[PDB]
Ligand binder design. Structure first.
Ligand SMILES: Nc1ncnc2c1ncn2[C@@H]1O[C@H](COP(=O)(O)OP(=O)(O)O)[C@@H](O)[C@H]1O
Lengths: 315, 45, 426
């Protein structure tokens, strides 16, 4: 309940934010649409621009967002724009910015596992300067992927199966239901991003204060997900792509205690999946072992493919 | 003018005895992994 | 025009097999001889050093085309073959495996001979030999192509030869560099492009005619053209035949849209408003003129948007480099103009943009191009997106025409209301 109570705090806190700018969205005037238009535009383009080429230019995007969010004018498409246009706008850009970070993790990071690190650092860095934005990220991240909390949605009475899948995070149109494979990746990329944000820090800025969402949240995530019965394909998948991304940073921090966790899932939690998963869905559970057999004997968990290196930061 | 400190680890104190005995064990016990991070004293156990 | 360059580029960028769900047809010399099928490399009982090299380069089990081709080629007595399967199915890896099985490195003279249409393609085929046969010490390779300087009275000691058609003939015929009567395996790789030169077809046969009868004859082609099939029969006597029909691609999973714009500056403004409206990772833009593409990419770069530009002047290797970066996520948008127009197997492509419509010569709709451009995005159930820029009534006329051929609706998208644009990519 400690987690579920905290889970609700962020969710209903976001719902408060949905309402604070209520009227900016719900407006049909030609100006009122244009203002909503230019803001949602000049607040999500830079996030989509995030690239792996070089941190040298990854600072432009970071500065362009800090300026936008801090109130400064930003060079948008054609005319420059700021938030001073509308007083209920600030609380709106913070909402659209937060979702886009998870959205970029939904689509890109799912497809491209390496783009997780150049996106996270910017997210982890903006989280520092403006904490209210981070709660909004944790809000969306949690809803779209409840497995990040982590908490598994239970099956309430009345078998509205279509209604249940929606809670599981499946995206279903009135007529259409999402495939598992198009869904699994959507959730991988969401927790590969989360696993990256908790270990990365914005190098620039001279901040003597610590990470807003620290690597402690990675330990609890592994602890709290391994103390409950695993789902068939979801767990054995998400457990893997979380360790590949953050397993290196956890091994350095909790040197022995972490290893204890790993020697458990390998001999104690692996049997917990062999029975649950059917023979037609063992794909994930197999990667999960191929991941440990190396790491367990090698005494080392490889650096996540795509980690930002010293060269990237100069260029 | 103050800077807060880190919560990366959990103090040895302010930790229940269950969690303390778990971190100290050579092996963890299934379904009873402590939610709080480990302490700095029992890192190299 | 120039199918060798298309093939060369496809080789440099291909990272793994192309999935194919179709079943393989087999047409054996003896119709009633049982069908040869295998599902693992253990079954073939390869030499240890060979199986070692197979597992070494990342292969787990035989590919779909290989499940039938390998046992047929390793069967005793040596049985010839004509295999037809699209580029990327494992044709090259198949005959390379067959070659290395018949060679016995103790004998220092050519025992296997491959014909590749060009020097560059020969090199790529050569690289596969060197990888799979890295555990064959003393096993070397000789390149019998134009440019290779050799003097008389010298004798090739290599157990494998690969070369262009015109020069391999000289090796054996006049210059006496190879004794054809010791050749145990013969390959003609990529016949679909080999025929593009009339000179090659005749030179290849003459070579085939100097070989013994017990020499294993193999031919491979990406296309099922008749000119190919007529050419293959002359080269391979008493041939088995293996076919795998090309993987078809559909729009079952893609949503088609179009946007009306008064001019080009509007097509650019229309393109900007789309960004931020939806979760777009990476995207491809296809243009009509190189003058416009360089302008768009420049205009797009001006906005601070990072872009990759593919133009015709660029060398082949240069094209590959930009494409590689694009895949690696260095670039988020690839603007191109008839350079690799069919569509690249990038995985992170959220949307395909047709700033100008896929137009065939004579001014007709290029439906194959339209299909291949978008078919890649949503194959095997993935989700894709498509947006077509219409700048005139003639362009609009073409649009409905495409809509006819596929009979799938390309609805209109209005770029003023962001609320509407969010709905489509959800
Ligand atoms: N059995 C296999 N398992 C895994 N990858 C393979 C296998 N065979 C080929 N590949 C890879 O697939 C790609 C295409 O190989 P293939 O021989 O070369 O193409 P083609 O049929 O056009 O000649 C190469 O990168 C190659 O390494």
């Amino acid at each position: 309940d400690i987690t579920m109570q905290w889970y609700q705090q962020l969710q209903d806190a976001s719902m408060q934010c949905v309402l604070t700018f209520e009227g900016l969205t719900n407006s049909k005037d030609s100006q009122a649409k244009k203002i909503k238009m230019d803001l949602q535009k000049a607040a999500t383009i830079p996030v989509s621009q995030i690239s792996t080429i070089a941190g040298s230019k990854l600072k432009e995007i970071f500065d362009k967002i800090h300026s936008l969010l801090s109130g400064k004018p930003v060079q948008s498409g054609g005319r420059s724009v700021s938030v001073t246009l509308n007083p209920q706008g600030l609380d709106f850009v913070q909402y659209k910015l937060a979702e886009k970070f998870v959205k970029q993790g939904e689509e890109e990071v799912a497809s491209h596992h390496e783009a997780a690190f150049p996106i996270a650092v910017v997210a982890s860095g903006i989280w520092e300067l403006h904490p209210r934005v981070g709660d909004l990220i944790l809000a969306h991240l949690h809803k779209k992927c409840p497995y990040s909390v982590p908490f598994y949605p239970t099956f309430k009475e009345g078998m509205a199966l279509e209604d249940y899948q929606r809670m599981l995070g499946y995206q279903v149109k009135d007529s259409k239901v999402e495939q598992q494979d198009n869904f699994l990746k959507r959730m991988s990329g969401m927790i590969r991003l989360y696993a990256a944000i908790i270990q990365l820090r914005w190098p620039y800025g001279n901040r003597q204060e610590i990470h807003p969402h620290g690597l402690n949240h990675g330990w609890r995530w592994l602890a709290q997900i391994l103390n409950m019965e695993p789902l068939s394909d979801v767990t054995a998948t998400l457990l893997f792509d979380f360790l590949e991304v953050c397993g290196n940073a956890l091994m350095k921090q909790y040197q022995v205690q972490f290893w204890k966790m790993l020697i458990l899932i390998k001999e104690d939690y692996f049997p917990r999946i062999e029975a649950i998963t059917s023979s037609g869905q063992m794909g994930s559970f197999i990667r999960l072992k191929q991941f440990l057999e190396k790491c367990l004997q090698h005494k080392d968990i490889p650096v996540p493919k795509g980690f930002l290196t010293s060269s990237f930061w100069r260029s | 003018i103050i800077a807060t400190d880190n919560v990366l680890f959990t103090p040895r104190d302010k930790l229940t005895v269950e969690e303390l005995e778990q971190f100290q064990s050579k092996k963890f016990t299934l379904g009873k992994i402590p939610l709080k991070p480990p302490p700095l004293e029992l890192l190299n156990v | 025009e120039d199918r060798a360059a298309q093939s060369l580029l496809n080789k440099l960028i291909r990272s793994n097999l192309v999935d194919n769900t179709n079943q393989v047809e087999v047409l054996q010399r003896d119709p009633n001889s049982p069908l040869y099928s295998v599902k693992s490399f253990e079954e073939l009982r390869l030499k240890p050093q060979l199986l070692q090299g197979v597992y070494a380069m990342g292969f787990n089990r035989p590919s779909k085309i290989q499940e039938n081709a390998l046992p047929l080629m390793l069967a005793e007595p040596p049985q010839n073959l004509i295999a037809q399967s699209q580029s990327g199915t494992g044709k090259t890896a198949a005959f390379v495996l067959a070659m290395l099985s018949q060679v016995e490195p103790a004998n220092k003279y050519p025992q296997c001979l491959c014909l590749s249409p060009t020097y560059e393609l020969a090199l790529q085929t050569g690289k596969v030999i060197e990888q799979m046969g890295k555990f064959y010490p003393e096993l070397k390779l000789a390149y019998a192509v134009r440019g290779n300087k050799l003097e008389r009275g010298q004798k090739i000691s290599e157990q494998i030869v690969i070369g262009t058609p015109g020069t391999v003939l000289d090796w054996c015929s006049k210059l006496k560099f190879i004794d054809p009567k010791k050749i145990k395996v013969f390959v003609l790789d990529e016949a679909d492009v080999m025929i593009a030169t009339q000179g090659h077809q005749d030179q290849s046969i003459r070579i085939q005619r100097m070989l013994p009868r017990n020499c294993q004859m193999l031919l491979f082609s990406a296309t099922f053209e008749d000119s190919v099939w007529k050419f293959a029969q002359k080269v391979v006597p008493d041939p088995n035949v293996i076919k795998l029909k090309r993987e078809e691609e559909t729009l079952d999973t893609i949503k088609q849209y179009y946007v009306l714009c008064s001019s080009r500056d509007e097509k650019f403004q229309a393109l900007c408003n789309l960004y931020g409206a939806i979760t777009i990772a990476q995207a491809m833009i296809f243009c009509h003129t190189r003058k416009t593409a360089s302008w768009l990419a420049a205009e797009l770069s001006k906005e601070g948007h990072q872009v990759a530009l593919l133009s015709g002047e660029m060398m082949v290797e240069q094209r590959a480099a930009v494409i590689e970066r694009f895949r690696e996520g260095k670039e988020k948008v690839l603007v191109t103009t008839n350079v690799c127009a069919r569509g690249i197997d990038v995985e992170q492509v959220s949307v395909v943009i047709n700033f100008d419509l896929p137009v065939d010569k004579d001014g007709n709709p290029d439906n194959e191009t339209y299909l291949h451009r978008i078919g890649r995005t949503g194959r095997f159930g993935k989700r894709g997106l498509a947006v077509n820029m219409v700048d005139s009534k003639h362009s609009m006329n073409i649009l409905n025409r495409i809509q006819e051929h596929f009979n799938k609706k390309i609805e209109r998208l209005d770029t003023d209301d962001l609320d509407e644009i969010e709905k489509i990519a959800n």
